[PDB]
Amino acid sequence: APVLPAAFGFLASARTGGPVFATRGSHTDIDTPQGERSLAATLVHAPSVAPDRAVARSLTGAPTTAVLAGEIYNRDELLSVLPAGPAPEGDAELVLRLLERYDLHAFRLVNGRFATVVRTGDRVLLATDHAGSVPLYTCVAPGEVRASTEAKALAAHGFPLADARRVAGLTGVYQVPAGAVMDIDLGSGTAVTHRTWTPGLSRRILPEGEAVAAVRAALEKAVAQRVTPGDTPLVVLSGGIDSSGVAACAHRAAGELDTVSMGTDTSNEFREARAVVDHLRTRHREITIPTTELLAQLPYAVWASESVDPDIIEYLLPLTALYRALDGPERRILTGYGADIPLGGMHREDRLPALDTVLAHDMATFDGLNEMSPVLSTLAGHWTTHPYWDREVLDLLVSLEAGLKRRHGRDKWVLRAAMADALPAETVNRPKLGVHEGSGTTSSFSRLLLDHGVAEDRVHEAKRQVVRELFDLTVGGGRHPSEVDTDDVVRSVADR
Ligand SMILES: N=C(N)NCCC[C@H](NCC(=O)OP(=O)(O)OC[C@H]1O[C@@H](n2cnc3c(N)ncnc32)[C@H](O)[C@@H]1O)C(=O)O
Ligand SMILES: [Mg+2]
Ligand SMILES: [Mg+2]
């Protein structure tokens, strides 16, 4: 529903001397008071949004300009540490007020879904939220610093930056790691990176009672922060405990709930989803996308996510299509995505030792996948947020000892028990089922391959070659997905 962030993404630059995005929306070039020596930036955002709130300026320290894509959820908290009074008019101004107090350490305090770039004097700051849910890339050269929330905008011509990965194929284009802040001196072109968050490695113990309660309270608040007062949110659900947990909380926070479920002509989860829409009495809508169409949208998913990971792509393909086929006006969409990462729910492990090993490195290897990028939905005009990856909910879920994740013969137990009084028993105890499984994405994507020659002891690697190809063409090539024929790229790869 209405009330989206002041901005979805952006392209900025800071020099001593027309961007094309996947994100759909309006563009607004911000003013440049000191012109040449100011921070130039093109903002991409909803046509019904006033970019203002995403831009803030000041003279504190120096001439300072701040651009912020996304939103912050722990506003009251952040506002409580400041000299109360001149409340900022937005998140960008909020960030600026915080930077004046804690400097770059301010980002250690922010709980949100954002990406920002700030310039003060010849100093340039680049930051992401604890999870890096709003991809942020950069080209740093002595005297020139280009920032963008999409690598495709920076894929034309920087110098190597340490503590930052290079974007596949591109050269001189880096990504700002998750939960980090790059301190950049425009003069020398030097960049220092500070991490402002890192998964916890220790585990805490708690009796079922307290554990189930803390997990519920946290989730409820994570959702409360994400739902806008007034309009009814939209929840994309499966009729999994994850998205059902979220639907339950959102329903309470908004008093009403619109839901939507995706399916293909091979399989779907409409029955599991219906069992939830009926319990909660939500306004439901089932969308079925032909497997052929599903696969035909491969280049769009890779173009929006800017990822080259085959498996993640299979997870996003169904979701991406669903966002694109969504009917009606731009919505504020909540999800239950990510819940499995801190729970190892995608591994189906009954052995605590293996469960901890698995859930752990999973937390240490999510950066760079962009699975939770907002572009997956903003390419269609929809804003998405994921409450399970809220910093507070993530911290807690991650910290729980394996015996609370795998317990009583069930996985993700703690969460299942946390929602047992708001969802039907069949739902709470429904076995884990990937979006890419309950729709036949992974299976279908293996025919189109096998149906082109590639045999067994290859298939996975082949998908990896197709996905990498789509990337080079769209992200690193300037080619719109609609110009890349999936079946063509598949053919050129069905070889070796
Ligand atoms: N980096 C890692 N190591 N982890 C990767 C694994 C990530 C994992 N995502 C894959 C996964 O199995 O999805 P899964 O937990 O099934 O699916 C993800 C989320 O997508 C939405 N969703 C799923 N199926 C549908 C459907 N049919 N219609 C509408 N919305 C739907 C739901 O809101 C749900 O909470 C997850 O944790 O969400
Ligand atoms: Mg899940
Ligand atoms: Mg599922």
Swiss-Prot record:
UniProt keyword DNA repair present: no
Any GO BP: clavulanic acid biosynthetic process
Cofactor(s) of this protein: Mg(2+)
A cellular component term, taken from the record's GO annotations: cytosol
Cofactor binding notes: Binds 1 Mg(2+) ion per subunit.
Pathway linked to the protein: Antibiotic biosynthesis; clavulanate biosynthesis; clavulanate from D-glyceraldehyde 3-phosphate and L-arginine: step 2/8
Keyword annotations: ATP-binding, Ligase, Magnesium, Metal-binding, Nucleotide-binding
Residues the record lists as binding Mg(2+): 242, 340
Gene3D superfamilies assigned to the protein according to its UniProt record, in alphabetical order: Glutamine Phosphoribosylpyrophosphate, subunit 1, domain 1 (3.60.20.10), HUPs (3.40.50.620)
A single GO molecular function term of this UniProt record: (carboxyethyl)arginine beta-lactam-synthase activity
Catalytic reaction(s) noted: N(2)-(2-carboxyethyl)-L-arginine + ATP = deoxyamidinoproclavaminate + AMP + diphosphate + H(+)
Documented EC number(s): 6.3.3.4
Subunit record text: Homodimer.
Family, similarity comment: Belongs to the asparagine synthetase family.
Protein name per UniProt: Carboxyethyl-arginine beta-lactam-synthase
Phylogenetic placement of the source organism: Bacteria, Bacillati, Actinomycetota, Actinomycetes, Kitasatosporales
This protein's encoding gene: bls
